Design a protein around this ligand. Structure first.
Ligand SMILES: [Mg+2]
Ligand SMILES: [Mg+2]
Ligand SMILES: [Mg+2]
Ligand SMILES: [Mg+2]
Ligand SMILES: [Mg+2]
Ligand SMILES: [Mg+2]
Ligand SMILES: [Mg+2]
Ligand SMILES: [Mg+2]
Ligand SMILES: [Mg+2]
Ligand SMILES: [Mg+2]
Ligand SMILES: [Mg+2]
Ligand SMILES: [Mg+2]
Ligand SMILES: [Mg+2]
Ligand SMILES: [Mg+2]
Ligand SMILES: [Mg+2]
Ligand SMILES: [Mg+2]
Ligand SMILES: [Mg+2]
Ligand SMILES: [Mg+2]
Ligand SMILES: [Mg+2]
Ligand SMILES: [Mg+2]
Ligand SMILES: [Mg+2]
Ligand SMILES: [Mg+2]
Ligand SMILES: [Mg+2]
Ligand SMILES: [Mg+2]
Ligand SMILES: [Mg+2]
Ligand SMILES: [Mg+2]
Ligand SMILES: [Mg+2]
Ligand SMILES: [Mg+2]
Ligand SMILES: [Mg+2]
Ligand SMILES: [Mg+2]
Ligand SMILES: [Mg+2]
Ligand SMILES: [Mg+2]
Ligand SMILES: [Mg+2]
Ligand SMILES: [Mg+2]
Ligand SMILES: [Mg+2]
Ligand SMILES: [Mg+2]
Ligand SMILES: [Mg+2]
Ligand SMILES: [Mg+2]
Ligand SMILES: [Mg+2]
Ligand SMILES: [Mg+2]
Ligand SMILES: [Mg+2]
Ligand SMILES: [Mg+2]
Ligand SMILES: [Mg+2]
Ligand SMILES: [Mg+2]
Ligand SMILES: [Mg+2]
Ligand SMILES: [Mg+2]
Ligand SMILES: [Zn+2]
Lengths: 206, 97, 23, 83, 127, 60
RNA sequence: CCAGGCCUUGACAUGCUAGGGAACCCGGGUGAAAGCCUGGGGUGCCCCGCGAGGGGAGCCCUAGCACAGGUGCUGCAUGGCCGUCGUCAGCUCGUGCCGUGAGGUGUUGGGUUAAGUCCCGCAACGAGCGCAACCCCCGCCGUUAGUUGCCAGCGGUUCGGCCGGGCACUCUAACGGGACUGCCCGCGAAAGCGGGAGGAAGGAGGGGACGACGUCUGGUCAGCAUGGCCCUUACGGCCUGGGCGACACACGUGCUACAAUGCCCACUACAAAGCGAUGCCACCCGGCAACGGGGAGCUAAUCGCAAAAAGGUGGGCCCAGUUCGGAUUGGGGUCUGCAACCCGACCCCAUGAAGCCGGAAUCGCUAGUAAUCGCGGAUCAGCCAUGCCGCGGUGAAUAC
């Protein structure tokens, strides 16, 4: 096991943090821990909606949580309903100005954390792991993407000898920093144990 | 008369460090420029894997860049309009006299 | 010397002070 | 050592047992977990059972062995040698 | 009236001032030979003036910051050389063959993780 | 000894000497950084994800 | 981990039944503590409420049921993360061609490069993961900005950039420029190779980040995740003590040395990166000292840590198991902490061991490197740090 995490490798170049705020030595942890408590609760409920990106902003005792998602309707609710019932739930933990937005995802197939999340689902439903991956890539590419690669490790089909299977199409220059790589990881539970799903999407370079 | 500007990302510090200085340069009168103070750096070094493997670490850094601007000749037209400024999230300000 | 506490060079090693290295 | 400006340490609860018995006249047995204590002049002639982690070790205190700690008289390790 | 070049070597920085006068040389408010006493490596800092016969012709106010006495010396040696090239542009010949205008990027290499220093590896025993 | 230990770790003790830091994310008792509240393992995991404000890889 | 004393919806989550009253704070008996026994004190809402009185449910207590909990086993069921060969020049794919077929071809061949690097050739023609580039630090210059940083000039100067005054210079920290075999001679089919120039920089500029398909049924169920197997008044949990620090021995990585290119004392220089509001602590005083009592500044380019040290000047030692070396122990103190017996660091008086350059064997380093010198940081009450991650000072030898 050798390769670098291709997100953290690109911070400050092609990818930007999901927590953009300042704090001094004596306060940093307490806020960061809240983002931790928040992101869990959000992804506990919003997993259904098709959660893509959890952005958090701060100033002083107030915070704007910009959530990206593939079904904005399941997030917002009945006429402003669900998105409300979370605002209260949100400021219960936060104890502060919980401004909770919901943003469009102009294609789940160009969203790496989504492509993965779906494959993690398909194999929870006893589906052909090889075929499912070639499909996952085949979707992403048909939506004009420049390149794609998808990886599943674990007891495929229940096999006793664990195996890592993978597939790819186009370009994926993970050594290149001026190239945009969206990466998303999805962990699939089953009866025989857990498998892991890695997705890399090459949008295009800068 | 003093403005202090502090953030984690400098490209948004210099945006806001210029923007505040343009404002007071508008509504009168003296701007002693955006003087970039030395950055205070806290490095984090850590063994990569979860178990053993001591001879392989990774280096992380945290840059708390500093800025200072001096609006010298006040003109309280500045005292109202600064109270309304568009300073992005990742940045702190401290105001003195 | 560097191991000998009762000297100048010795207390510089430890990073402490005393009669044999005053501050 | 224990900083001279402060006190001479004895665990509150044990000191009392010595002093209670001093009135009545000593001595029964004193099962203790007070290694952190100091042997103290009032303790001479008593027979104290010190816990070494394992046992309650019977130690008759004398006029000579006063300034020390209790646990110096209850050995923590069993060692008979090698081979 | 004055001629300044910027001299660097390592962490040492040289502010050097060339002025026609007896040949007096000063560093941080002391006579050169006082500030560099017993440093055999010093006399060579005042080398570029030999490159163009300037032993007596100039005085010098010089400050110095960073590095150490011999890193500070090499910066000076560069700066007084640097300063001559402005006082007389024709001095470029007989200064480049001496490499007096060029400054080396030779600096202390980063201590690397998994090593004792920058390159000294930890000693190793197989069987 | 596990969950009872992350829980014993937060409650204020019988003497203040006994204060020890447990990584607020996974509960690791060893290598816990004050600044983040995390262990060197979580440190790297959140960071790589880009959920640590202002944090980026050092290269010099 | 072990000894002893203890707890049973349980130190913890999400539910229901019913009892108290909700909640929270203060003490008491007992015991090593835990625990077990106890003595206090007043609930909002919304409500029939001048009235006995009644509940809902923010919460604590109590008898049960669910269920908790396990660093118990399995890295030979696993995800993740890492080591590794290896920064090595490699590993494949699409189509076509070849072979009954595994497969070959391309990827071999000439040359060139740090490289499947580029060129030339060819039943091959392209495509991909790697190489390189894009990103960071450093070396030169520039634009912008001038305090807390800098002071070239002038003027004041209590003699300190201290004040006026200035951003020129050093700097601080962002945005650019610059290097490309681009020019010359030449050898070359070409890619390139030797040399020359300009230039701070030259042929990847120095270092960093970055690690192909795979290998090791590699490592980690003890960071976490997780299938399964296993325990349930206990393989869970709470505590007090002890162990993880043992010692006939063997090995690994280290520190300090055996000395004169040295040891010691006095006076005297020149770094960098960091760090710091029950934190760093200038300065003053008590102390041989560790430290202790005062007390100023600093949310820190302002104030502090702070002396950098090897170095320089002078003086002593005079070849000795020593004014080398600083282990071992005796005695006395400071501090941190509830507490330094096991088992902390530091200071002082005395003690002053081995060791005279290391058997067979064996390690690292190709230049600002090795060697030597000090400084900081993470963890952190203190610290067993001589470890680790960094930072500068001085600064080689050698590659036929
Ligand atoms: Mg089953
Ligand atoms: Mg000595
Ligand atoms: Mg030495
Ligand atoms: Mg001389
Ligand atoms: Mg060095
Ligand atoms: Mg090591
Ligand atoms: Mg090894
Ligand atoms: Mg657990
Ligand atoms: Mg502690
Ligand atoms: Mg800890
Ligand atoms: Mg394995
Ligand atoms: Mg194993
Ligand atoms: Mg594994
Ligand atoms: Mg083919
Ligand atoms: Mg054949
Ligand atoms: Mg055929
Ligand atoms: Mg084939
Ligand atoms: Mg090949
Ligand atoms: Mg082949
Ligand atoms: Mg060939
Ligand atoms: Mg190579
Ligand atoms: Mg290529
Ligand atoms: Mg070919
Ligand atoms: Mg300028
Ligand atoms: Mg060449
Ligand atoms: Mg590369
Ligand atoms: Mg194995
Ligand atoms: Mg586990
Ligand atoms: Mg398991
Ligand atoms: Mg151990
Ligand atoms: Mg041996
Ligand atoms: Mg060592
Ligand atoms: Mg050794
Ligand atoms: Mg002797
Ligand atoms: Mg101790
Ligand atoms: Mg001696
Ligand atoms: Mg002998
Ligand atoms: Mg001798
Ligand atoms: Mg030697
Ligand atoms: Mg030798
Ligand atoms: Mg031999
Ligand atoms: Mg080499
Ligand atoms: Mg510290
Ligand atoms: Mg410490
Ligand atoms: Mg010890
Ligand atoms: Mg140190
Ligand atoms: Zn953790």
């Amino acid at each position: 096991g050798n390769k670098i995490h291709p997100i953290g490798f690109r911070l400050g170049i092609t990818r930007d943090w999901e927590s953009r705020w300042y704090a001094g030595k004596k306060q940093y942890r307490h806020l960061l821990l809240e983002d931790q408590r928040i992101r869990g609760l959000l992804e506990k409920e919003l997993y259904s909606a098709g959660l893509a990106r959890v952005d958090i902003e701060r100033a002083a005792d107030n915070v704007a949580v910009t959530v990206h998602v593939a079904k904005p309707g399941v997030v917002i609710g009945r006429g402003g309903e669900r998105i409300r019932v979370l605002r209260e739930e949100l400021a219960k933990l936060t104890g502060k100005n919980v401004a909770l937005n919901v943003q469009e995802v102009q294609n789940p197939n160009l969203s790496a954390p989504l492509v993965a999340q779906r494959v993690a689902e398909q194999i929870e439903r006893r589906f052909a792991v090889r075929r499912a991956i070639k499909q996952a890539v085949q979707r992403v590419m048909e939506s004009g993407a420049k390149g794609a690669k998808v990886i599943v490790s674990g007891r495929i089909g229940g096999a006793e000898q664990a195996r890592t299977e993978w597939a790819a199409q186009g370009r994926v220059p993970l050594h290149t920093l001026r190239a945009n790589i969206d990466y998303g990881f999805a962990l699939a539970r089953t009866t025989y144990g857990v498998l892991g799903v890695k997705a890399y999407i090459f949008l295009g370079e800068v | 008369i003093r403005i202090k500007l502090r953030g984690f990302d400098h490209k948004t510090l210099d945006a806001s460090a210029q923007k505040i200085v343009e404002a007071a340069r508008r509504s009168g009168a003296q701007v002693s420029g955006p003087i970039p103070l030395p950055t205070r750096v806290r490095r984090f070094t850590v063994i990569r894997g979860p178990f053993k493997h001591k001879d392989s670490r990774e280096h992380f850094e945290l840059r708390t860049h500093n800025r200072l601007v001096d609006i010298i000749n006040p003109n309280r037209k500045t005292i109202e309009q600064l109270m309304t400024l568009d300073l992005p999230t990742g940045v702190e300000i401290e105001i003195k006299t | 010397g560097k191991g000998d506490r009762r000297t100048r060079r010795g207390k510089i090693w430890r990073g402490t002070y005393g009669k044999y290295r005053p501050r | 050592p224990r900083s001279l400006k402060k006190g001479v340490f004895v665990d509150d609860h044990l000191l009392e047992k010595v002093l209670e018995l001093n009135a009545k006249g000593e001595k029964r047995l004193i099962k203790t977990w007070s290694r952190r204590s100091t042997i103290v002049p009032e303790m001479v002639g008593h027979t104290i059972a010190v816990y070494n982690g394992k046992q309650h070790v019977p130690v008759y205190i004398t006029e000579n062995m006063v300034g020390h700690k209790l646990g110096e008289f209850a050995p923590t390790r069993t060692y008979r040698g090698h081979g | 009236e004055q001629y300044y070049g910027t001299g660097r070597r390592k962490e040492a920085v040289a502010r050097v001032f060339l002025r026609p006068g007896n040949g007096k040389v000063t560093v941080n408010g002391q006579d050169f030979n006082e500030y560099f006493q017993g440093l055999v490596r010093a006399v060579a800092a005042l080398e570029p003036l030999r490159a163009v016969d300037a032993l007596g012709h100039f005085d010098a106010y010089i400050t110095v910051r960073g590095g150490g006495k011999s890193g500070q010396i090499d910066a000076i040696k560069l700066g007084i050389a640097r300063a001559l090239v402005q006082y007389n542009p024709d001095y470029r010949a007989k200064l480049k063959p001496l490499g007096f205008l060029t400054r080396d990027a030779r600096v202390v290499e980063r201590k690397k993780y998994g090593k004792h220093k920058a390159r000294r590896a930890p000693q190793y025993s197989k069987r | 000894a596990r969950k009872a230990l992350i829980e014993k770790a937060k409650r204020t003790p019988k003497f203040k000497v006994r204060a020890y830091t447990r990584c607020v994310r996974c509960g690791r008792a060893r290598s816990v950084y004050r600044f983040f509240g995390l262990c060197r393992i979580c440190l790297r995991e959140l960071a790589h994800k880009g959920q640590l404000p202002g944090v980026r890889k050092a290269s010099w």
